Symmetry: D3
Subunit: 263 residues, 6 copies
């Protein structure tokens, strides 16, 4: 229901969940045109009141994404590369400010720009046989410049991130799970359904609160504790005035099922 | 030594103060409880003899289930705002107090209950204590007493986000593995093993322990280059302390240090 | 071919893009002000040496990497001298995160107090499986880990976990250190130096300009808010896009051949 | 005609959305721990009163707003007590910036030391043109402005100017205070109270929910990196967009008529 | 290339200077469509290596901008408003990350969202007869929600900004200059010219240094000093490797006129 | 008096004076900074020094910045390290116990202003000349803290305007934008600067010192914890000899006998 296809990407919308399917090429190596579409999708989904969760997945076998297209980067003026990197970063930055919870469904290789895109998502689920995950940019004389060095350091620790970034080595889904690089490892041929089940459980709950919780944590982490709780407190104020908060406190007190409306 | 309030009791002995929570069957609090809790924190702050504070529940299956849902029902939204602000500022005080605060978790520690525990410096839980987490989302609201923020900083933002949006609670063992608690003791030995730890602290160079607690809890909020400056001033206070003179000597003379906490 | 320069507290060896700072102060490598003055000089020297891309800090003392500050020297000093002694040591350790070279602490023995603090200031920490004890026992003396210990430990392994270790002063094993993220690798004791050098060799033999800018991006970027941290990362990347290794690296990849890194 | 509630060292008056906290400790309004407990209590009471939109802090003592801490009280306390005393006073002042009411310090007399620190903690400062002296002379006593004075002054008028004023301990005039941004207004001595009240009444009679969220946005948002500070500003705005006053305010503007504010 | 147009705005590119002329409404009150065009103008200029300076000005008499359209805002639902505000904010946030120096030429009223846009620019020049400047949002029951409260506080001081925001009172160009709300105050008639003169001088200098100086200050101000200087250092490293640094450096020794090339 | 190649250090009555006598326009190189750094370390370990004044022995210049000849010669990688060292040296001032005062009697531009900026206070003469950052006219920026310290001192927009045009300003204008703390009649700039320093050295110097540290380092911290830092510095003061002597003298209304401890 309501699926708008594009050149390198397709968006499916249904039951409060939007699915952004990637299909750029055989390794999903992106260029500036792909990000233009990806950015347009986030904007579109942001303005869509119905969507509570966005799952980002790949339609390309064995690959979620391998990163930027090296061939596209060859005939690139340095100043162009700069603006190209800047636009990709700003696009990824938008996810943390969006009301929907973004989930990266990793079924294939997620390296370089590929992992950077997943790191920008709120959560990451991976198949027990998805392959490699990491940032090998160093093997090309460059670094993970799409927030990879900064987001990985914050996600798994600055020392562990430094190790991975300088050696450019990739790891397994199981290893990514233990260091917190991903939130869940599901059996391979069961990754999509288990991801969708999680997203479905979110879409059918107090979605206004799940969204505010998402904003509280993602943007509050950049703030000094004493004022971060002020930000958290304003998001709560909005919830205290919502319909679901009333319906929720009631249903609980009446031992009945809550009728979530998302507002 | 003993000071009983309506929802809480404070026991002081051998440099250790224990705050016992006895609000109700699930220890679900209201504004009145927090006023008493705040008063206890202030009283203990002005008592130079207390070096460690252990917060524990006298209620069987609960440390604290959080805010009394009924008490907040139909309460004015502006009131809730002020109620939350007061509860937050009260919890914020722990990180600025000289005593090391330890949360002794023997029962369920959820919602406001966990938020209170998160504001403590350390957390020790029993292997059969139950569940621990933030289920607020199931009510259409969030962990607004510092839960979203302190959990994110303690166990990681992504892991905290996952727990907060699903509202699912985990076990003590799981909590230990992700760093949500510092120790998991045999249920029946939880209280004694916590007191044991507290006693070792209270019998050591307590001025150092105190300044160490301050350096870390408040220093973590500063850029590293100036945080070490803060750590430095706390060190300057220790270098001029009596225990520091005694500690350096007792060490060179291969003997047992006689700490005074000064 | 291989140059070696020595002093009384430490010796610096330089070879094929790697510098090794060997510590030989005393039975437990307990340091004083003069030691740090030499360590600081080594850092400055290495910084101004374009050929060095990696630095390994190791100890030539049997059972110790370093037990921290010399209590004999530490005491007997005026509180104002201690303040300045500590400030200088901290500023010295602070210089590592700002240096182009990747600093690796090769831990083969006890690494406690100031010893661990020095190790915490390095970019990576590798320890032997029989290296001994690692922790911050300063509290047992009535003082605290004042050379960055309380702050760096908290940021590395978590504030509550660091609080616990600092207030009790208890030390842990190499294995336990590995599980909480205190060290990055635990190698078989007799292979510690070997495997550490092997790791450094691989770095020195790769796109060292990228390696260097990556280290700067993370160590200094972690102190900035995310939205601007990526800007700092972007400028470091700009420098890399303008380097020769980048050109070389991209060509070798498309032309499917081993790239020949020049470090610039 | 305001509702009046008197304490031992202060009196709180309430009327038409405005609360006034009158200080009457002693001849120089030098405070002790008891005063601050009453001040803290007043802040809490007002916070829980949804009718109060603005709070004006003023003195009933002729030539002094407040000269700071009672030096007698301060001299006889254990250093550990002083620490807790200062900590309590600071936390009390910190609460102003988190409160929904706009706090205005009405300075008609000398405002020095802890007196200025209390004023610095308020959102705005209005001073009469013959109020006297203002500054932090703590250094002349061998101590510093420990109630947030060094920090808030630096942030308000600039760190170098604040440093100069703190290290010398010299006070300045209301006109000099105004030019460096230490106070927001200088009114004729004779009508300093009425004009402060007039400013307060305009606020209290406007879209108070917007005034409050604006005060919160700026005072707490200034502690956040810009990219997320605007997110905080955004949630406060979201609360207004859902307010009754926003609907009315926008309508009144379109209908070119006077808004009927409800504060909700 | 040329001086391309759009609906509510037109961009003129010439000799390293791009002028964004606003012509939205008789008061230049904007809506979402306008910001979309403004965002597009920003992106286009970014990817144009020849543009060094960007001048934003109004073609509408007596108004630089009066802010958002109250009709567009009044009737919109809360959730839409949120996304609308978020988009405008992210658009303005981009100016500080752009290589070009942004100058706001204020010849008419600059209030509410109008001032907020000017605040997001690097510099502000205003005519001595330009009229009023301030944030009157509070008189509508809302606040300066597009970076207004935050940038004003950082620019002129939190307490002064607070005073201005809660009273909604606007001030004169002269008073604005006194508090640093604007950088220059030119004679009304000589405003567009003096602004272009200043922009001309910039475009004819070591333009790479100017760009990096702007990036160093606008983004570095968000960092703790000790690392802010590291950021300044990397931007400097780029300058040390540029052709202009080598030029201006030697030219300086040779008591000669530097021939800048922007690289 | 302790003399060095590029500078000289004079110590007396609790005040240390670092006189710059590098060259014609006091345009520095790496060696100069190695000496400045050494001076800072020496002064730090001298419990007698309470104030430090940086002044020039050169008539029309405080300092014109980095020596362009010495610079051009350098390789890009050397420049990085050269700058890094200079920056770290200037950073040490904000962490030192002494209050640093830059005495500006001549031109203070580029690296010259960057050095002055790292000092705690700046006093300048009404006929001292120009002050600013003209690095842009060379194709580079004020890479030794200039862009960052200026922005924080006079405001980011005003600093941006000055940095991109490289325009220098007069002493009077500097005072107006807060670039300097004082402007004295040329002839009495050193005299009046030394009076200020003298009044500092003769007061409760431990307090003056902790105040300088509280402000300079606390400004890099969030307010809620910055006040904690301020609090610990105050705890040290409450335990000093002077605090007791200061509190007494006031209640006994007698001039206090400071000891600096």
């Amino acid at each position: 229901a309501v699926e708008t296809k594009k050149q390198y990407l397709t968006v499916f919308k249904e039951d409060g969940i939007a699915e952004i399917h990637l299909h750029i090429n055989k390794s999903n190596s992106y260029d500036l045109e792909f990000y233009k579409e990806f950015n347009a999708a986030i904007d579109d989904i942001r303005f869509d009141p119905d969507i509570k969760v966005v799952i980002v997945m790949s339609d390309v076998p064995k690959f979620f994404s391998a990163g930027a297209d090296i061939n596209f980067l060859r005939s690139a003026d340095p100043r162009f590369k700069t603006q190209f990197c800047l636009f990709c970063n700003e696009t990824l930055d938008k996810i943390a400010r969006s009301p929907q919870v973004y989930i990266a469904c990793l079924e294939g290789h997620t390296v370089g720009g590929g992992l950077e895109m997943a790191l920008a998502c709120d959560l990451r689920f991976m198949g027990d046989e998805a392959g490699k995950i990491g940032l090998p940019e160093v093997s090309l004389g460059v670094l993970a410049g799409t927030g990879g060095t900064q987001r990985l350091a914050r996600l798994i620790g600055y020392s562990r991130a430094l190790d991975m970034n300088i050696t450019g080595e990739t790891i397994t889904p199981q290893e990514a799970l233990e260091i917190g690089l991903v939130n869940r490892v599901f059996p391979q041929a069961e990754t999509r359904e288990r991801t969708r089940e999680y997203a479905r459980k979110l879409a059918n709950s107090a979605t206004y609160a799940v969204s505010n919780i998402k904003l509280a944590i993602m943007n509050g982490k950049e703030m000094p504790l004493n004022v971060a709780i002020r930000y958290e407190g304003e998001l709560q104020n909005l919830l205290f005035r919502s319909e679901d908060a009333k319906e929720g406190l009631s249903a609980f007190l009446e031992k009945r099922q809550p009728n979530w409306k998302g507002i």
